[model samples]
Target chain A: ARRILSVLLENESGALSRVIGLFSQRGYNIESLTVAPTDDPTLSRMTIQTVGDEKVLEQIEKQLHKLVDVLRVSELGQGAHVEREIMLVKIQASGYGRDEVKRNTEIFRGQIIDVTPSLYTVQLAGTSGKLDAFLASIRDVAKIVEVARSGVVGLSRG
Target chain B: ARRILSVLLENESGALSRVIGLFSQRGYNIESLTVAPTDDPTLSRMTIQTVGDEKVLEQIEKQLHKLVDVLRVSELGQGAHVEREIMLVKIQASGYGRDEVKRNTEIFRGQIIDVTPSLYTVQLAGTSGKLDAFLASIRDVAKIVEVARSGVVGLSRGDKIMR
Candidate 1:
């Protein structure tokens, strides 16, 4: 099953490197990972989206819990949680379906942040699933030139 | 100076690990990084935001370019570029300023994605600067309990920066 683990850890390369290295060395699956400073500047919140078998998932959790640099680790997507990813996509805008592209971007509630008549840079925020759907919808309307996705980041819900 | 480098690399641990280990082993700076698959399924894009001296920045770029796993490395925040980050923050919502917290979230254009009588999880997206400002605005209005940021991912504008 797939899971997202939110890890609170001390911020530094050695620590970050080790955490990532652990997954790599152990042959665990790492779908995507995002690390950024938390409200507590002393530490960072690393959101890791990974998947594995039930036992392997437990093993991944246990291994993560044992890392000295890791302060805390909790699984998301299990209980009520909110997961989101942000993407900046640049697409061709000079085609015959330019209006359709814009309309679809609006339909997806995405904002076209940059435009030059030749291309449009659209910013979309949602779950990875929704992000993929947006791309699928636009794939037919226009040509996707570039894309940059800010991997999943989530928090436990109430 | 601070720079955000979006590097497209093969999707694997050896490649990913080597690139990260390179930064750590060299004692280079990594403010934050986000790794996600690109439109190209065979490759993943890693956005690294780091700061260093002028010479060090040059060295970082050169070192990154030399790595076999790295395919293309482009520097953002230079000219016409767009940078953004997403953040989720859990904050107290039961204080005397309950309504105020909601109002502030509205002010920052953040949606209260999750809410209970005790707390509220607000999702905010913007430039890191704007994100900080939103956090700042909410700080005084309510108490933040937890936060998860999506680091910074950017794309160049105009006719360049894509491979």
Candidate 2:
């Protein structure tokens, strides 16, 4: 099962570590994660994505509640929600490769963030699926140099 | 000073916890962080942003080197890099508020990702500063219900990465 857990945590030292440590202790690997300070100085919102058995996952769900620093936790994908991530990819570009990348970027609604004689960097934001689609579409057109992803962050739908 | 640190690490249980535990032990509060699996099955790349004293930060930098799971570390802001974050904001919208938010979204090149009878959700991607500016720009026109940020992620420039 895929679970996207959102937490409202105390914005203080050691708080994040404890939560992550708990996950590690349980032998659950977080597939992707994002945490940022919120408008309220005292709180930070974090989103964690993972895959595991539903039975053990629900057990961890209760385990999270006992952690003091974690104020709230909810599964996002279990309900209507919007999730997104940002990715920056550097790829080789020369002659036809440059033309191919440019046209693809346009088609994907991504922006060319950087360029050099032999490379072009594209910035795109969307769901994990969308990001993968864009990357898969361009892999053959150019040589991928590197990639940096901002994982997945999301909110429940109204 | 604001610092953006990128690390490539072995993707396994306890690796992330140990790295974060080190920061917590040193009393350095990370302002934001994002980590995800990469093309390489055994590796994950993480980006962390923090602000603190230079002397203490440099000491922590070396401390990271001692972590066995850590493979590489580079300060993105220290070099030519492109960094970005994604934000989703849900706001109260009705009548003039809807029109106001719609115009502001257009001006910022953000897309309205969801809509309801009395609310609008907007998705924006950019530097932290740009996200803050957009949030500030719409405060008065509508009431903000919630926000989710994907922190910051970047790569070095040229044939390799960012700005």
Candidate 3:
């Protein structure tokens, strides 16, 4: 199962390494991860996406709680939540490819942030599924040159 | 000074730890970080925002290149590039505060992704400066419950892309 674990940790040196090291030591595969300081300067929030057995995930959750620097850990996937990811894709857009790429970008509600004679860079933000769909739709129209993704950041629904 | 470094590495176990551990060992302060797999399944890309001296940053860059797993490293802030971040903010919204919050969201081009009677969760994506400005504009109007950010990610503009 794939799980998104949201963790709050002390904003200090070695804290991130310790968390990541714990996973490496345990052999848990991290699919995606995002970390940034929160409103409080003393804390940082990390959202980690991983795939593993449910029982092992519970174990990792317990271990994360045991870390002194970790303030809190919540499984966002286990509850109601809103998750989003941002992607920047550089694609070939020349000649006949231009109109098709533009139309697909409009259909997906993505913005063309950068453009060149032969390339158009599109920026899209949504669920991981939506991003995948956008990539699939554009595959035939343009060749992807590069892709930068901001993983997945999620919050529990109110 | 602050810098944003985009790194490409093999998507293998312990690769991320080695990179992060290098920063921690050197006492480098990581302001923010985002890591995700690229279109290529064999590799992942990481964008790290950190603060340090130019000398220290150069040293870090050299060390990053020395890592066996690190394939490419580009200092995006050092060149002409487009950088962006995403922020999720949960704010208390009720009564008079609700209308003001909605207006502010429109002004900032943010979308209300989740809502309840008393709270509204907004999603905003822009450069770090834009996101900061949005937060500052709303600080006085509503009480912030939580904030989650997907740290800076960028690519060089035009045909020059960091592969």
Candidate 4:
């Protein structure tokens, strides 16, 4: 099964590498990863997606918690959380493809966040399912030229 | 000196960790980092920022190239490129603070992307200097409760790939 993990850490140089090193050393695969500076300039948050057996995951969690720079580590897969990701999608849409792009964006509830006459940029945020649905709809209307996703960033919802 | 490096890697299990391991084993520091999947599901892009001496950075570039999963790595500090980072700033705001928040956003060319009665979220994107300037202006307007930033991601101008 896929598992998502959230970790907070001190924003120190090489700190990110230490956590990533532990995973690589142990042969844990990271399906998706996102890291960003948090509210504190000296702090950062990282979310990683991976899959493994239960025992291996437990060991991974323990190893992660043992890192000095790691402040908090939570298995978001088993928590009540609000997870989101940001995606900037650039699709090929020329003059004749304008309306098709518009209709697809409307169906996906995506914002035409940026646009030039020849290109259309769509911005969307939601669960992985939502993104998958949107992508499915747009694939027929326009060719996806480029995409950048923020991976999964989550907060434990109270 | 500070530098931002962007890398493209094969999206395989443990690939990210291997890249990270390279830095840790060398005792290099990562000031900021961000990674995400690109249009190609089999490939992912990473942005890593670090600060150190010329010798250390040269070593980093050399070692990064040695990793099998690392397809490409570019140091943006030396190139003419378009670099951007997005920050979602959640601030504590009250009904009375609406105008203040709006003013701050207007000055920074930021947008109040999300709002609750007690909280306001501002989204801003720009060079590091521009972002710092905007953040400094609103640091006191309301308590910044949360922040999420996509570390600097860049692309060289005119269809050149940084391989």
Candidate 5:
């Protein structure tokens, strides 16, 4: 099963290293991960997407809790949650292709953040699937130059 | 100074650990990090925000390039690029304050992704500064329960790409 674990930890240098090392050492497969400072300067929040069986996941959770710097761990996917990932894609756009790309961006509710005479950079945020769909849709219209995705950051639904 | 580095590495279990361990071992502070699989199945992309001196950064880059798993590294902040971060904020919203929260969301171009009778979850993405300003703007009207950030991910502008 795939799980999205949200962890709160002390904002210290070795804290992240320990968490990631735990995964690598234990052979846990991490699909995606995002860690950033929270509102509280002393704390950082990490959202990790990993896949494992139920028993292994429980073990992983228990192990994560054992880290000294780790404060809390919550399985966001175990409940109703809102997950979002941001993507910036640069595509070849020129002449007639530019209008098509703009129209598609509007349909997907994406913003064209950067523009050049022959290229357009589009910014879109949503589920990973939505991003994949956006890329598939634009493949025929313009050649993709590069893509950068901010993994997945999620919060439980209240 | 702070730098945003975009790294492409082999999609191996220990690759992330090795890269992160390098920073911790050297006492280099990591402000934020995001790692995700790229379009290629065998590769992953990592965006790291760190602060260090020019000499330290050069050393770090050299160390990264030496890693067998690291395929490429681009210091995005050193060039013209577009950087953005995504934030998810859960805030208390109820009663008359609900209307105010909705109004502020529109003003900031944020979307309410989750909602209950007592709480609202807002999603906003922009430069880090914009997210901070949004949080500051909503402080008086609601109590924040949790905030999740996707750090910063960027790409160089134009055809000079980092892939």
Candidate 6:
């Protein structure tokens, strides 16, 4: 199964690279990753998605806590967490394909934020599964021109 | 000087990893990067913010275009593009500071998406520069608990959209 881990760390140059490097070197895969400085410039938060067995995940968490730059780590896989991912998808839609794309996007509650006669950029926010479904619906006619996604970020639901 | 390059690529397993590896291997710094699958499942687009000189940026663009998965590349530096970035800022606000935080957020047209006795999560969307200024304004009293930002996605001004 996939797990979401949120880590609090000191915001410093090269700090993020090191953390990512650790995962890559250890042969762990990051399904999605997002990092940005917290309001406190001195602190930063990272949301990382990785998959592993329970035992391995626990080990990974423990090892992460030991890193000097890491302040705290929270695993949201078992908690009441609100997970959200953002995606901007650009599709090539012309002729009859344009109306078809619109119908599908409307059904998904996606917005047509940018439009060119030959292409349309759609913005959608949802869980990973929802994203996958939306992408599948438009696969035939429109060619995905670009994608922008924020690594998973979530808070333990109250 | 620095430049931001937006790229469109084929959506395939491990395709993003390859792009990231390219920058890492070449010692190029990715200041900000965001990627998502487009309407087409086989394509993905990314906006990457990196710094370099003119010649270096040109080379980066040329090399990026050559990548097997990449489909198109464009430069969106101070151009006629509709750019937007979203940020979630979690701030620590005591009862006494709540009003101040609320007022500041309103001034910036930010939305107070969540609240607790001691903290509030604010959601704001705007140009990168505006977001930076908003963050600066609330830096003193409320400690920032977390921040998540989307790389800028842009469209040319006027009526045309990239298909």
Name the top TM-score candidate: 3
Q: Which 10 consecutive residues of model 2 chain A have the lowest summed lDDT?
A: A52-61
The deviation in Å at residue B75 for candidate 1 is 1.4
Better of 1 and 4 by lDDT: 1
List candidate 6 stretches off by more than 4 Å: A8-14, A40-44, A103-109, A140-143, B7-27, B35-46, B52-83, B91-122, B133-145, B151-163
Candidate 1 chain B: minimum summed lDDT over ten consecutive residues — where?
A: B93-102
Worst 10 residues of 6 chain A by lDDT: A11-20
Compared with the true structure, what per-residue lDDT tens digits does model 3 show for residues B1-163? 8988999999988999999999998887898899998877589889998887877877888999999999999998767799999999999977778998899899988899988999999999999999999989878888989888998888989977777
Question: Which residue runs of candidate 3 sit more than 4 Å off their true CA positions?
Answer: none
Rank candidates, lDDT, best first.
3, 5, 2, 1, 4, 6
lDDT string, candidate 1, A1-158, tens digits: 78888888898788888988877877777878898877666788888887675677777779888999999998887777789999998888886767877998999988988988788889999888999999988787798888889999987787
> What would the TM-scores of all predictions be?
0.94, 0.96, 0.97, 0.76, 0.94, 0.70
Candidate 4 whole-model C-alpha lDDT, 0 to 1:
0.71
Docking class of 3: medium
Per-candidate DockQ vs. reference = 0.74, 0.66, 0.79, 0.37, 0.75, 0.25
How should the candidates be ordered by DockQ, best one leading?
3, 5, 1, 2, 4, 6
Between prediction 1 and prediction 5, the one with superior DockQ is 5
Best by lDDT: 3
Model 6 C-alpha lDDT per residue in residues B58-145, reported as the tens digit of each score: 6787778768888887787756665666676778887657888898899987777667788787766666888898888878867777
Highest DockQ against the true fold, candidate: 3
Global CA lDDT of candidate 2, please?
0.86
Report how large a share of the reference interface contacts model 3 reproduces.
Answer: 0.78
Better of 4 and 6 by lDDT: 4
Q: Which should have the higher DockQ, number 1 or number 6?
A: 1
lDDT of 5 by residue, B6-108 (tens): 9989888789899999999877778899888766647888889988787787788889998999999999866789889999899997776788888888998
Tens digits of per-residue lDDT, candidate 4, A28-105, equal: 777677776665778888878776665787887898889889999888767554555656566777765778888878
What's the distance in Å from true for residue B140, model 2? 1.1
